[PDB]
Amino acid sequence: QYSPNTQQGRTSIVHLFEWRWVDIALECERYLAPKGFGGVQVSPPNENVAIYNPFRPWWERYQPVSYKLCTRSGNEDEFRNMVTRCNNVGVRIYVDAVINHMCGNAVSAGTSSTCGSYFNPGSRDFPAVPYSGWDFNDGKCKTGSGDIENYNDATQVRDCRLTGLLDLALEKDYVRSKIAEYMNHLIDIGVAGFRLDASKHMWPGDIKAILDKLHNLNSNWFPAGSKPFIYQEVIDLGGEPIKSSDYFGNGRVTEFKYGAKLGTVIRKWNGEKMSYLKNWGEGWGFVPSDRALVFVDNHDNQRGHGAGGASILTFWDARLYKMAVGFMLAHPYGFTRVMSSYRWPRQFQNGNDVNDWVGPPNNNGVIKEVTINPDTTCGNDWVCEHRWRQIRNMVIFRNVVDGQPFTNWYDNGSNQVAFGRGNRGFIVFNNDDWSFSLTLQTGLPAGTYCDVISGDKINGNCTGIKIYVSDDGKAHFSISNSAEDPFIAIHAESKL
Ligand SMILES: *[C@@H]1O[C@H](CO)[C@@H](O)[C@H](O)[C@H]1NC(C)=O
Ligand SMILES: OC[C@H]1N/C(=N\O)[C@H](O)[C@@H](O)[C@@H]1O
Numbered sequence: 001q002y003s004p005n006t007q008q009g010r011t012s013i014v015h016l017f018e019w020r021w022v023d024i025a026l027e028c029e030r031y032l033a034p035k036g037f038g039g040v041q042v043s044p045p046n047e048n049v050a051i052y053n054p055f056r057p058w059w060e061r062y063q064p065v066s067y068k069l070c071t072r073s074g075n076e077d078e079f080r081n082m083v084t085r086c087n088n089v090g091v092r093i094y095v096d097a098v099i100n101h102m103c104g105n106a107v108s109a110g111t112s113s114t115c116g117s118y119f120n121p122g123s124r125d126f127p128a129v130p131y132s133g134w135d136f137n138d139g140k141c142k143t144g145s146g147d148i149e150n151y152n153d154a155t156q157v158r159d160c161r162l163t164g165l166l167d168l169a170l171e172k173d174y175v176r177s178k179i180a181e182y183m184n185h186l187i188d189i190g191v192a193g194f195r196l197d198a199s200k201h202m203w204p205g206d207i208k209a210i211l212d213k214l215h216n217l218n219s220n221w222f223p224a225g226s227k228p229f230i231y232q233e234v235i236d237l238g239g240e241p242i243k244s245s246d247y248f249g250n251g252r253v254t255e256f257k258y259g260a261k262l263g264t265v266i267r268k269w270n271g272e273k274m275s276y277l278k279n280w281g282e283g284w285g286f287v288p289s290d291r292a293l294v295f296v297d298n299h300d301n302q303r304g305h306g307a308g309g310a311s312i313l314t315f316w317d318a319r320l321y322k323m324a325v326g327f328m329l330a331h332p333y334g335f336t337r338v339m340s341s342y343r344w345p346r347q348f349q350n351g352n353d354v355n356d357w358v359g360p361p362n363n364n365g366v367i368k369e370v371t372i373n374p375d376t377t378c379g380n381d382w383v384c385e386h387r388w389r390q391i392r393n394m395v396i397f398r399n400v401v402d403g404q405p406f407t408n409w410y411d412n413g414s415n416q417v418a419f420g421r422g423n424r425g426f427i428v429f430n431n432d433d434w435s436f437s438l439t440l441q442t443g444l445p446a447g448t449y450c451d452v453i454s455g456d457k458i459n460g461n462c463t464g465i466k467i468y469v470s471d472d473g474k475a476h477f478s479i480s481n482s483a484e485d486p487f488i489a490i491h492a493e494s495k496l
């Protein structure tokens with residue numbers, strides 16, 4: 001249950017946030033498969049409320065109306081087509097499962113849904129599922145408002161409404177069955193696993209009951225006995241009665257402390273320095289590596305909607321972001337998820353982005369397709385971080401060094417550090433305000449290696465910086481604090 005089910009040799013998944021199924025299918029074939037990406041986390045594929053005020057925000061997809069595969073990303077046929085094509089090329093699909101709640105209790109009854117399904121929040125009526133008033137925790141929640149009021153009370157955090165979202169009575173067999181019916185439909189379609197949205201707001205035991213109802217993966221693509229990959233979104237930064245460890249029996253958990261701390265260290269906030277990353281991992285109080293799903297930023301906190309705060313690094317901070325992602329992909333801790341976003345007009349007022357609700361690039365509500373520019377970058381406002389040379393090459397770096405131990409660590413007591421992965425790869429970082437020029441032990445076999453951050457290895461030649469490793473495994477590295485990308489990475493496959 002803790003295995004990603006990716007193809008051997010592929011070690012990361014990418015979140016193609018708000019992408020259309022047709023665009024993801026093409027991407028699997030033209031880019032993801034060729035570049036060695038393990039899989040894709042897709043946005044919720046089930047019908048949601050169509051919110052027009054504000055105009056179609058990204059968060060409307062976290063307010064379910066039914067389990068019909070019909071959204072702004074596409075319909076069920078397009079969804080199945082995407083899963084099939086991606087699987088045939090060795091790229092897995094992971095579904096964002098929104099199973100803790102339905103839509104806001106204050107949402108107007110009617111057919112303002114992505115598939116026209118009728119729903120009535122007021123009377124707890126969702127005929128397309130179907131769910132009724134007997135299927136929600138209204139009578140179970142003990143708060144005066146019916147919403148979660150105090151996170152220090154583990155009970156209301158689970159039984160009450162998260163900011164007004166109707167809370168499903170997950171203890172009922174009927175509700176558990178409708179949810180499992182939905183998930184098994186996806187499993188039989190070919191998905192390899194799920195991101196359980198808002199797991200903190202569900203009892204570990206209720207999740208387990210649901211998981212016990214799931215089938216094994218589609219035997220047309222996976223070996224018999226394969227279980228779906230499960231990673232639960234649990235925000236645990238300490239200081240709360242709920243611990244992410246309470247969920248280890250169901251699968252992996254999102255380690256939000258990872259990005260929050262990496263961000264403060266790289267930004268060099270309050271005395272933090274990269275030299276302190278020598279014992280990065282459990283040594284920093286993180287969950288066990290084999291139970292962790294790590295990432296620098298996620299769809300919520302890159303726009304200040306989750307946990308991590310102002311320390312979180314995103315594509316907006318391009319230079320430092322590439323460094324954080326590089327460190328993450330080079331370090332052996334956890335299973336890595338790469339973010340792929342779209343640009344929106346950030347409008348800061350009193351320290352807060354008033355346009356944090358803006359949905360994906362669109363034409364009157366219809367999501368724009370991902371266009372590919374001649375330099376492999378994307379158009380139509382899709383950022384496509386997964387296509388940035390520095391990030392794409394580190395995704396490959398992780399595959400190449402998979403299994404190799406963390407070794408040959410070096411640091412200058414400040415912000416210039418380096419380390420290798422067995423004898424398959426080596427990486428160097430310079431985050432100090434002065435240049436780095438030193439000869440280091442890399443542990444790599446003698447030869448000429450192409451730096452994969454500044455360039456590529458194309459037809460027996462390097463398009464960027466070249467590194468020369470001597471017989472003793474030593475090599476000289478020179479990185480100016482003025483370099484566009486203040487770090488260098490070389491591996492077994494970038495060797496000339
Ligand atoms: C490497 O690049 C040089 C030009 O810089 C060229 O002369 C040479 O043929 C290239 N090597 C290969 C193997 O293509
Ligand atoms: O930040 C509040 C809440 N909001 C959420 N999404 O908007 C998360 O699913 C949940 O884990 C988090 O605790």
Ligand SMILES: [Ca+2]
Nearest residue numbers: 158159167201
């Ligand atoms: Ca709940």
Ligand SMILES: [Cl-]
Nearest residue numbers: 195233254298
């Ligand atoms: Cl997440």
